[PDB]
């Protein structure tokens, strides 16, 4: 074997026991452990597990403070070298150079891998969790001083690297594609005439594309810190989960805009054209794997004001009813089909974030923060591995960018959509439902007639792209 440092001079040398670490029943997987044992494994010398570093850096704040974490890794980094062996002493004692066989093995198989792994944690920490440092000036000073005190040429490469990364984070991403983006499509509204932009005047293909770019960017901007600890559900959610809430609010706003466009179109024939156009937008969302978009349409079609318009849906062509029905089936039985579909497509895609939120919340409150063993209170690391597994899935879909051209004015149009106006939720919600009752009264009241409100052709240009440029 290989003798480890004395447990009296190096705390990370205490042997494993049922009192400080528990493994799951092919690297070892930690079920629970003390903070000391968690950090030892975080920087273990025997095997690798980059999955562990992300999990830990993402979740440690509930069971360990940043300042303390830094103290522990620096302490981990400071490994005392072993005393000369009997063979070495005999050589030194004769005036010659010791072979130091064991010392050299210890540096190669224990010290180096442990120190490199400590440095790896530091780099990732500063690189992807810089907010800890932004919120604590002294924490950053201590890290910069630690990194600057590291001597030896066997580390200079990484020391220099981390020092530069830290400085880049204090001062303040191009994309290359296989093929070229498709040509932007226009319908009734022409380029530059933002005043004519509306649901039926913009090309349905371009509506779906621009909204997908928009929704993709909102999705890609959600950081794990906005999810861990279920902070989006607490009183300070606006402060802790701003990007997540921006994304959800955009989705809600778009669903209400679809509902409003439908019920405010009193004339039956025109309303049919409006519903039909929205289902075509849905069709493009599906082709683009924009599941969030698909569900915004489904939620709209299933809202109280819209769901009850039987006369309208009766005139929708059968092919479109099927498209809407298949989309609706994705959510049935707790999203069984959606989950299967998401796991089978080829990204880029825009997942529905709702599912993730529910799973994180349940994982967080369905598992204890600590496990007790022989009176000892161990950190329940399995609970953290589960939350990190979910945040990791979210991140995997945040990597692939869409190969579509942004159209400044259309993007602006959709960013400024405000269906509710300055009206409160309850009032607006009631307004939509009352409009629904007006345009299609409850039985046995007869269906009235209403005048046309659109002065331009209602024929859809379709959702098949054209190829000229």
């Amino acid at each position: 074997q290989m003798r480890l440092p004395s447990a009296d001079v190096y705390r990370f040398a205490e042997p494993d026991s049922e009192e400080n670490i528990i493994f799951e029943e092919g690297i070892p997987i930690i079920k629970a452990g003390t903070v000391i044992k968690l950090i030892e494994r975080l920087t273990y010398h025997m095997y690798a597990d980059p999955n562990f570093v992300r999990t830990f850096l993402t979740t440690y704040r509930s069971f360990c403070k940043p300042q303390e974490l830094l103290s522990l890794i620096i302490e981990r980094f400071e490994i005392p070298e072993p005393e000369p062996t009997e063979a070495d002493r005999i050589a030194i004692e004769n005036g010659d150079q010791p072979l130091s066989a064991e010392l050299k093995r210890f540096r190669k198989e224990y010290i180096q891998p442990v120190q490199l792994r400590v440095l790896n944690v530091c780099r990732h920490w500063v690189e992807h969790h810089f907010y800890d440092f932004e919120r604590d000036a002294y924490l950053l000073q201590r890290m910069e001083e630690f990194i600057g005190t590291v001597r030896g040429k066997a580390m200079k490469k990484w020391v220099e690297s981390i020092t530069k990364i830290i400085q880049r984070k204090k001062i303040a991403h191009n994309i290359t594609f296989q093929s070229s983006p498709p040509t932007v499509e226009w319908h009734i509204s022409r380029p530059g005439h933002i005043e004519t932009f509306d649901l039926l005047t913009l090309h349905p293909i371009e509506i779906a594309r621009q909204l997908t770019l928009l929704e993709s960017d909102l999705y890609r901007a959600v950081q794990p810190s906005e999810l861990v600890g279920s902070v989006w559900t607490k009183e300070d959610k606006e402060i802790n989960s701003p990007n997540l809430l921006k994304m959800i609010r955009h989705t809600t706003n778009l669903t209400l805009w679809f509902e409003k466009c439908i019920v405010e179109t009193e004339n039956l024939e025109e309303r049919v054209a409006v519903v039909s156009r929205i289902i075509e937008i849905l069709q493009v969302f599906q082709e683009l794997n924009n599941f969030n978009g698909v569900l915004e349409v489904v939620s709209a079609m299933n809202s109280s004001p819209v769901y009850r318009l039987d006369h309208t849906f009766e005139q929708i062509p059968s092919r479109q009813k099927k498209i809407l029905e298949e989309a609706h089936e994705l959510s049935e039985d707790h999203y069984k089909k959606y989950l299967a579909k998401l796991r089978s497509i080829n990204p880029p895609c825009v997942p529905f974030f709702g599912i993730y939120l529910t799973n994180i919340l349940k994982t967080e409150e369905g598992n204890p923060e600590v496990l007790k063993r022989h009176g000892k209170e161990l950190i329940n690391f399995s609970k953290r591995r589960k939350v990190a597994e979910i945040t990791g899935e979210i991140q995997q879909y945040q990597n692939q960018p869409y190969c579509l051209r942004v159209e400044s004015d259309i993007k602006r149009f959709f960013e400024n959509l405000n269906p509710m106006g300055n009206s409160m939720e309850k009032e607006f919600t009631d307004y939509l439902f009352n409009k629904s009752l007006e345009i299609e009264p409850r039985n046995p009241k007869p269906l009235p007639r209403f005048p046309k409100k659109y002065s331009y052709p209602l024929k859809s240009p379709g959702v098949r792209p054209s190829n000229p440029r």
């Binding site: 209400l256 939620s299 399995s382």
Partner: protein
């Protein structure tokens, strides 16, 4: 056998998720993974009758307010939950009930009012206020403590009985 589709509704942070977890999960296992199938189903015996409970719980998704109608329409019975230390959540009950009546297109929908104790904070809604509100709607009132597993089964079983007697 008969399957009952039950929906848990209420403001965020009132413990809807804990209630569902306490009812469904295995209480004598170290780890819980909601990412596994059937974490919403539970076969139980109520008044000698064996049935399947399907809990439609979307806790954590409260901000998706436009998706509410769709999530509610599929339920047969509803648990209207509020936190006893949060007066706002209690006052929101009225609108949740109205929304349920609108989506189910009925003036007599099976539902139970649930007052849940989330922590050790001070209680701001007394039982008498809740019992009076429940009486005004013609529905049962059940107080629970998901954390200590008190009243959980009672809340859901009372709703199933309400559905059966409908």
């Amino acid at each position: 056998m008969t399957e009952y589709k039950l929906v848990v509704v209420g403001a965020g942070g009132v413990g809807k998720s804990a209630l569902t977890i306490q009812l469904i999960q295995n209480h004598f296992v170290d780890e819980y993974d909601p990412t596994i199938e059937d974490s919403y189903r539970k076969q139980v015996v109520i008044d000698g009758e064996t049935c399947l409970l399907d809990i439609l719980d979307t806790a954590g998704q409260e901000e998706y307010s436009a998706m509410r109608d769709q999530y509610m329409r599929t339920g047969e019975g509803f648990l209207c939950v509020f936190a006893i230390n949060n007066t706002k959540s209690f006052e929101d009950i009225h609108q949740y009930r109205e929304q349920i009546k609108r989506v189910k297109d009925s003036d007599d929908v099976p539902m139970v009012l649930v007052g849940n104790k989330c922590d050790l904070a001070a209680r701001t809604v007394e039982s008498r206020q809740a019992q009076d509100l429940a009486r005004s709607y013609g529905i049962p009132y059940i107080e629970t403590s998901a954390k200590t597993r008190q009243g959980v089964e009672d809340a859901f079983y009372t709703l199933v009985r309400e559905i059966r007697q409908h």
